[PDB]
């Protein structure tokens, strides 16, 4: 019996709200809100807490990190990153929490730093080849993937994907996606890397393609029910959930999950209270 939480976001500005969805009972409730307004952040589940890394507070790009205790229902704040990061990707790999890319917001970032629960400290690792804002990340088989995003240097949305090996500490390009996807919803399900939605300028996609690390090839699956960009993505019990986002104009309150067995996207029977974009999601136990 797991629960899914949605942290912060825009609606239409930075908020503090954090909603929770009970699967067994099909309902959305409010839990302990953030200590501060936060959106465009990286939200991960590192055993056994939920982390909110970087982001935007409606006025400034932040480097702070907040941690949630699903038992006492309260937020505490750990060590802040070295750099301010907004619209970044965050994931866990080999007991390390990586903060990937983001916005300064004077410049797009190619730098990556990792956090250790052991030392409570952020340290830089090898930077990406291309700076990426509005980037999504995923971890497959001890590898860290930075999917698409936006490059301020060349001024265009990216179709390139990079791979990070913690053993060698260097980034390499892999197979480019079928199209340019900025702010795509990135998740991992059954060893497969998913790139959902995203956008290139004003065009928001509902198409989804999936990467196979073994073959280094992208293949297309079923389109989502709706065009989504900047949505929250997490997977649980063989299903990949996509939460909120926006269609380039309006923030969405709908949530849909993907079933790789049947190749289907299914809407949740109950939308969120308030439509959110750039909100992070994670799954814990109640």
């Amino acid at each position: 019996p797991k629960v899914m939480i949605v942290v912060g976001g825009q609606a239409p500005k930075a908020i503090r709200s954090v909603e929770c969805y009970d699967f067994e009972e099909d309902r959305w409730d409010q839990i302990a809100e953030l200590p501060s307004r936060r959106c465009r952040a990286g939200v991960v589940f590192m055993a056994g807490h939920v982390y909110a890394v970087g982001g935007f507070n409606g006025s400034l790009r932040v480097r702070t990190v907040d941690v949630y205790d699903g038992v006492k229902d309260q937020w505490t704040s750990i060590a802040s990153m070295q750099e301010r990061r907004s619209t970044l990707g965050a994931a866990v790999l080999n007991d390390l929490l990586y903060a990937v890319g983001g916005f300064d917001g004077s410049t797009g970032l190619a730098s990556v730093e990792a956090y250790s629960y052991k030392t409570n400290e952020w340290f830089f690792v090898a930077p990406m080849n291309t700076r990426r804002s509005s980037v999504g990340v995923g971890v497959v088989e001890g590898k860290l993937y930075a999917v698409g995003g936006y490059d301020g240097a060349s001024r265009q949305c990216l179709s390139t994907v990079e791979q990070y090996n913690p053993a060698t500490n260097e980034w390499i390009y892999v197979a480019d996606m079928s199209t340019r996807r900025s702010g795509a919803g990135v998740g991992v399900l059954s060893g497969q890397l998913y790139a959902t939605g995203g956008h290139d300028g004003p065009l928001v996609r509902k198409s989804v393609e999936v990467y196979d690390p073994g073959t280094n090839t992208w293949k297309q699956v079923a389109d989502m029910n709706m065009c989504r960009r900047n949505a929250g993505v997490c997977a649980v019990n063989g299903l990949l959930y996509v939460v909120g986002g926006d269609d380039g104009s309006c923030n969405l309150a709908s949530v849909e999950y993907y079933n790789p067995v049947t190749d289907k996207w299914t809407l949740l029977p109950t939308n969120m209270s308030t439509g959110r974009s750039y909100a992070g999601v994670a799954v814990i136990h109640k």
Binding site: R61, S86, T87, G105, G108, S133, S134, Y150
Partner: peptide
Amino acid sequence: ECEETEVDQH
């Protein structure tokens, strides 16, 4: 800085 995200500033 600008409230908008980098990609939307474009």
